[PDB]
Amino acid sequence: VKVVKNKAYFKRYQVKFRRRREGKTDYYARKRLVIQDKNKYNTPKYRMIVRVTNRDIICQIAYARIEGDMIVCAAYAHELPKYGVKVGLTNYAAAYCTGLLLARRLLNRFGMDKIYEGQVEVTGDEYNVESIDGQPGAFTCYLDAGLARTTTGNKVFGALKGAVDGGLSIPHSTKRFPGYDSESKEFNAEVHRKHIMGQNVADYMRYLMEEDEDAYKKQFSQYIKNSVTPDMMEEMYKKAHAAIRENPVYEKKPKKEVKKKRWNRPKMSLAQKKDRVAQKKASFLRAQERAAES
């Protein structure tokens, strides 16, 4: 009596798209990130995909082909305890750290480590990579922020700054890095340098240790249950960038079987389904006979 339900709605319904129903892309920006202009005919346009997830950030470089996307090089946030970043897996320091790791790993795969050193002393400047004549050209790549909103302080820009100091020629404007004053249009390099080296959580740990030890034992428990103190953080990432820039080689795991198959129910067959139907017939007929009499 309420509405007219829905019957031809299904017969006329278009699905949106496979990635769009899950909600992971938009295609209105992918149709301008992916597609290479036809004057170059083969030379792919490299996308730096940086995805923020709870407990883990993902830095990948991919490109596009008609069979699918081909990922050249990938670096993940949980690899950093092998490099000496024990905890802090999703901070802005881990963003800069993973970008630096990804740039060093790509340049180590292509063999262009010794040239294009980029930046060693972390300053947070507008350091754009110049190509060197008489040498192979610099790797050029373009960001994908994804569905996440580009706001000053989004750590996809921290991953960008990590890759840029690693030595990837990525075009960027400075006004979305954190520490940028929004009213007065100047940019401060020292604030962004402090934010890369991670003295924000240093100040917030000192703030919690002054104000309330209840919250300091509420969060930061994994910090104190291995070790974190602010001077050790500010020297820790300083150690960690050199530890990455000396050995980015990534030692692949042995994977292996050593496992017992069996987790998930397979598809039951036609005859078994039809005999389920037959038992559902026979039991209801038996009930109709018996309980109506008794």
């Binding site: 139907v277 017939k281 209801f284």
Partner: protein
Amino acid sequence: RRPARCYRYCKNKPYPKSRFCRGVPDAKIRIFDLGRKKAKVDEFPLCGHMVSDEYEQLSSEALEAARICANKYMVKSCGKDGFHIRVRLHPFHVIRINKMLSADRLQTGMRGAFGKPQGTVARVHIGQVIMSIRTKLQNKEHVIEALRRAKFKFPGRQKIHISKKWGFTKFNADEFEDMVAEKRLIPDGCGVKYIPNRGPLDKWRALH
């Protein structure tokens, strides 16, 4: 009212009462069922229907006269509510009239010659049923005589068939009582609802 000899064989494209006509008067017929409208299915076993042989047009006034003649012969023959008659064919084509003397030469010639809408006719394909009368088994001669008396009042030549199907439905009269008695066909007023067995099981559980 122009003679129906000229408004005959389907020459022009179908021109329905629609968004573009906007000035066609009402059709002549308005009701379509005359007998026991609320008759259930087993109350009338057989049906005789009227098959067109030619490809032509039929006018709404002709349908109006024919259903009245068949109705009158039925209610004089086998009593009120001893029949259920249905005109299966509806008029939707709209014919045009370009009328003149609007007696002198001096109005216009054939200059503006898209005619005004005259009225409504019904288009017929060969082998399409005009009327269907569902009655008892005893009323077989009365159906034949009634559709004979309507045959003179339609134009052209068309024949009269006595159906193999039970009721107005599309199922065989031989298979019908043998198959409604147990399983599939549930009666629904004058109609008959078919059931497949590829439904949810709630239909079969609500049955039996």
